[PDB]
Amino acid sequence: MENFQKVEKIGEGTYGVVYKARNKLTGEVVALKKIRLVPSTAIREISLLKELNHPNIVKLLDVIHTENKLYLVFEFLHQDLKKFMDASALTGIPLPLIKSYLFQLLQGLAFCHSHRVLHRDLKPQNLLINTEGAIKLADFGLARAFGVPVRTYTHEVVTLWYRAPEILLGCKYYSTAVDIWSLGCIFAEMVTRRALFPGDSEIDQLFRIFRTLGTPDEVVWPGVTSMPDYKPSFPKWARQDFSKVVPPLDEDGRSLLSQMLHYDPNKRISAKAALAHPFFQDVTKPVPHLRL
Ligand SMILES: Brc1cccc(-c2cc(NCc3ccncc3)[n+]3[nH]cnc3n2)c1
């Protein structure tokens, strides 16, 4: 830590305070993350993430285990998508830019997933943008390392808006399809300028999902009725047309959103397959209008 000078508190993450900081020797400007509670297991797992390098993954520069505390030093980026969407509310992110960002995030998932590494807590606050038209995933792999708590260290509620339904139904064993689902929800949110499923508890989240996509059953999701927190007593809602759910998204876009939104995680499109989807045939890399 003494090798850093804290420029400023950026905010309060899942695990702890996030600082913008300068390496007190090397000049480099970085994101510094203190991790609350170190266990041998988390070290070895964190250390596997330093090698998981990709242009659409926020680079983990260094892990520091000293004084029995744990800091993570990250490539610094100046804005997240949550804030960028807020800034863009009056007219929406232009579709060519939504496509570029989606395309790039799928590239980063496709990388991590091929090495068997999931995010598990994708969300706008976790997706970070620069002035070059790029977008990157933060905190990849940290959920397996440390868990995902209900409240942060500052009791701030961790949002459920982007959580896949197999998790909400108590499935113990997640696959990579959970990130696809989150990303699907983020994709719908960029398009409509409104969160898809803003639940404020687990059941409100589940039921919000149900009301839009239909209560899942053994037809669409084999094995569903036998998941840990499934209850025969769930209300049975009918599914809504996607045309109602995300206008004015185009046919290709709606078609892809649907596959990213499949109940059965096994049926849910992979990142790699999704990059091949006709939605992305005219993809480009526009530069965002950023005010820092
Ligand atoms: Br709080 C919180 C929760 C999850 C991720 C991050 C960030 C933000 C960020 N920069 C975006 C901002 C946001 C606001 N002010 C300055 C930079 N990062 N750069 C590199 N890792 C980062 N992790 C912060």
Residue 139 in marked binding region = yes
* Tally of residues, the chain: 292
Angle formed at CA 151 by CA 6 and CA 37, multiple of 5 degrees: 60
- Rounded to whole angstroms, the Cα distance separating 227 from 66 reads 42
Nearest atom (ligand 1) to Cα of 77: 19
Q: Ligand 1: does its nearest atom lie under 6 Å from the Cβ of 74?
A: yes
Method: X-ray
Ligand 1 mean position, distance from CA 10 (Å): 6
Query: Largest Cα–Cα distance in the chain?
Result: 61
Residue 170 in marked binding region = no
Domains 1-78 and 79-290 belong to one CATH topology = no
At the top level of CATH, which class does the domain 79-290 belong to? mainly alpha
The full set of domain ranges for the chain reads 1-78, 79-290
Residue 78: half-sphere exposure toward Cβ, Cα within 13 Å: 10
Contacts of 97 (CB under 8 A, 6+ apart): 286, 288
Q: Ligand 1: does its nearest atom lie under 6 Å from the Cβ of 76?
A: yes
Nearest atom (ligand 1) to Cα of 10: 15
**At how many Å resolution was this determined?**
2.1
- Rounded to whole angstroms, the Cα distance separating 175 from 261 reads 14
Q: Tokens for 166, please give them.
A: 């197999």
Q: Which entry of 62, 86, 121, 179 is annotated as an active-site residue?
A: 121
Nearest atom (ligand 1) to Cα of 128: 11
Nearest residue by C-alpha to atom 5 in ligand 1: 126
Nearest residue by C-alpha to atom 3 in ligand 1: 13
Q: Ligand 1: does its nearest atom lie under 6 Å from the Cβ of 58?
A: yes
Ligand 1 mean position, distance from CA 9 (Å): 10
- Rounded to whole angstroms, the Cα distance separating 94 from 80 reads 17
Ligand 1 mean position, distance from CA 185 (Å): 20
Q: Tokens for 265, please give them.
A: 């995680």
Residue 245 in marked binding region = no
Nearest atom (ligand 1) to Cα of 75: 20
1-78 has which fold? Answer: Phosphorylase Kinase; domain 1 (3.30.200)
- Rounded to whole angstroms, the Cα distance separating 96 from 86 reads 18
| Beta carbons of 38 and 96 less than 8 angstroms apart | no
If one counts every other C-beta atom within 10 angstroms of the C-beta of residue 195, the result is 17
Residue 62 in marked binding region = no
DSSP string, the chain: -TTEEEEEEEEE-SSSEEEEEEETTT--EEEEEEE----HHHHHHHHHHTT---TTB--EEEEEEETTEEEEEEE--SEEHHHHHHHTTTT---HHHHHHHHHHHHHHHHHHHHTT---S---GGGEEE-TTS-EEE-STTHHHHH---SB-TT-PBPP-TT--HHHHTT-SS--THHHHHHHHHHHHHHHHSS-S---SSHHHHHHHHHHHH----TTTSTTGGGSTT--TTS--PPBPPHHHHSTT--HHHHHHHHHHT-SSTTTSPPHHHHTTSGGGTT---PPP----
Contacts of 251 (CB under 8 A, 6+ apart): none
Residue 108 in marked binding region = no
Ligand 1 mean position, distance from CA 31 (Å): 7
Decide if 121 is catalytic: yes
| Beta carbons of 176 and 271 less than 8 angstroms apart | yes
Contacts of 209 (CB under 8 A, 6+ apart): 165, 168, 197, 199
Ligand 1 mean position, distance from CA 292 (Å): 13
